[PDB]
Amino acid sequence: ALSLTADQMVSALLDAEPPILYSEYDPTRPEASMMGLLTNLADRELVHMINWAKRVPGFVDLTLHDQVHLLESAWLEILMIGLVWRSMEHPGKLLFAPNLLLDRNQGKSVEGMVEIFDMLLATSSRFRMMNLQGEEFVCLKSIILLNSGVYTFLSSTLKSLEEKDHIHRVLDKITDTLIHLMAKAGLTLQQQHQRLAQLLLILSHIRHMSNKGMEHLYSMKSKNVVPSYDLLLEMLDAHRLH
Amino acid sequence: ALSLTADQMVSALLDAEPPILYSEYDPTRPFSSMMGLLTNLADRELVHMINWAKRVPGFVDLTLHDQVHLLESAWLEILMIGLVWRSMEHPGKLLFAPNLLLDRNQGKSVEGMVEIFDMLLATSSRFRMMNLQGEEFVCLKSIILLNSGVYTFLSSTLKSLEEKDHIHRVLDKITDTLIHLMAKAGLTLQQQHQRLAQLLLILSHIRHMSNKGMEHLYSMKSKNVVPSYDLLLEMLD
Numbered sequence A: 001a002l003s004l005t006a007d008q009m010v011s012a013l014l015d016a017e018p019p020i021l022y023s024e025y026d027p028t029r030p031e032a033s034m035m036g037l038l039t040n041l042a043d044r045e046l047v048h049m050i051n052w053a054k055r056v057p058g059f060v061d062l063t064l065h066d067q068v069h070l071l072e073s074a075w076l077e078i079l080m081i082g083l084v085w086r087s088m089e090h091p092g093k094l095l096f097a098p099n100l101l102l103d104r105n106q107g108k109s110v111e112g113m114v115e116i117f118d119m120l121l122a123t124s125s126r127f128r129m130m131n132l133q134g135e136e137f138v139c140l141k142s143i144i145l146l147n148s149g150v151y152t153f154l155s156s157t158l159k160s161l162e163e164k165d166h167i168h169r170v171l172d173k174i175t176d177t178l179i180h181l182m183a184k185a186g187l188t189l190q191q192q193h194q195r196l197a198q199l200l201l202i203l204s205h206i207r208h209m210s211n212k213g214m215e216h217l218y219s220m221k222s223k224n225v226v227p228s229y230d231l232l233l234e235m236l237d238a239h240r241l242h
Numbered sequence B: 001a002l003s004l005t006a007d008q009m010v011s012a013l014l015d016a017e018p019p020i021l022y023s024e025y026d027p028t029r030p031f032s033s034m035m036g037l038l039t040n041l042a043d044r045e046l047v048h049m050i051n052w053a054k055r056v057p058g059f060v061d062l063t064l065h066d067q068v069h070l071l072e073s074a075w076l077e078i079l080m081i082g083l084v085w086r087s088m089e090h091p092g093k094l095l096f097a098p099n100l101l102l103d104r105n106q107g108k109s110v111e112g113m114v115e116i117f118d119m120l121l122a123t124s125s126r127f128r129m130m131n132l133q134g135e136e137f138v139c140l141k142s143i144i145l146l147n148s149g150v151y152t153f154l155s156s157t158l159k160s161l162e163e164k165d166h167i168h169r170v171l172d173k174i175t176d177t178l179i180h181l182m183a184k185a186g187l188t189l190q191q192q193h194q195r196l197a198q199l200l201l202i203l204s205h206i207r208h209m210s211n212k213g214m215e216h217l218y219s220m221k222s223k224n225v226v227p228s229y230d231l232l233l234e235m236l237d
């Protein structure tokens, strides 16, 4: 897993991509329905996200507790970068699903999105201006999975030191993979390091948007909206019986 | 400022460093008051932060309104990365000021720090394990200033496009500078790109910690605690 080539890593990540899901509304029927639609869509995406995470090279080498911690920290960032990616070719709008495309004025009335709708649109625009490639996108999504929770392993066991070292080794292999993609494309070494930094700085903005989103979700005080550690544990703690 | 060499950029940033300030308490009186000490310390740091920002190459080429927007987004991240930096050589503790060093158990009783004390300690430990250098630290703090608010200008005027392009040129020049520092130190090209990414990924964690801190500050409902756009505007004028 730490022995994949860059091309093999990219191939693995592309193979592991989850599907784009639909909103569950009757398209023959005529608000506050937006949060209901989004909550339902995110619930169904989360199941596929768990399957995807298990195929990110290196991720299933971690303990199940550490897998759960990472997913707990990252899942809304991962939903949001997917949203931004799908919206890249739809300026001024967010493609929540192929049947749920909203513009900014419509977003103005979506619960919890008073700040974040415009932040997501700006991110999508930035991706378009950089001409972000699918291979780069899947690298960034893997980086979020591995990085977002790594500085909150409040554990100091020998095993935890081993876990963090591994996570940093996988992150390093993804950095190498991103650089290789840029070299294949013919970028100079200076352009490669500049572009690597541009992409990684966007991750800080995705964290920001996720924190603002999570603030809203907790404010709802709805028992099942933020996935619990124990729920994520049940989905990740698979048997081998299938 | 887009014509500085990497070495000149580093010297400029090192020259521009703000001082380390002290907490204001009677060192002869007992101890227990932490949020009051920290809000006062942050208030006095903010004035020096504005002077520092104006010496970050490229920053004053921006409009006043865009300078305010950047500082409004970034100022707690900038305070927090400074805190993490001065705590690097104090494992298990946070050096809020040279006269205000608290351990983890003491942090347990500090308002608003139920989550972020441990997060700041983890960041300091990560800086120590990477052997972060002062030259790298000042580059990262400048990146935070230029990056944190750049995807929230919510403007598409020709002037705004010009402003965003400039911000990214300055960011690109700091990336070049970071890479040059790593090359001077003898890192291979592979080690350079890996270390650049490690450093920039820590910035996401600094954003996380600032958002958690800002949530607590807004919860205080204290009129002067979160600096207003208009207050920052007066200081930046």
Ligand SMILES: CC/C(=C(\c1ccc(O)cc1)c1ccc(OCCNC)cc1)c1ccccc1
Pocket (backbone or CB within 6 Å): A038, A039, A040, A041, A042, A043, A045, A046, A079, A080, A082, A083, A096, A111, A112, A113, A116, A212, A213, A214, A216, A217, A224, A225, A226, A227
């Ligand atoms: C930014 C849109 C958004 C959400 C979203 C973003 C990308 C997707 O692929 C699917 C849903 C969001 C995500 C999760 C939501 O509820 C969690 C349900 N249990 C996992 C509710 C809404 C939302 C909006 C307001 C507040 C927080 C998130």
Ligand SMILES: CC/C(=C(\c1ccc(O)cc1)c1ccc(OCCNC)cc1)c1ccccc1
Pocket (backbone or CB within 6 Å): B038, B039, B040, B041, B042, B043, B045, B046, B076, B079, B080, B082, B083, B096, B111, B112, B113, B116, B212, B213, B214, B216, B217, B224, B225, B226, B227
């Ligand atoms: C992490 C410690 C912290 C803060 C701190 C961090 C680094 C410093 O150099 C100085 C102050 C902090 C910062 C700002 C505070 O009030 C803002 C006052 N107007 C600018 C209050 C506390 C704090 C603690 C709880 C909630 C939010 C921030």
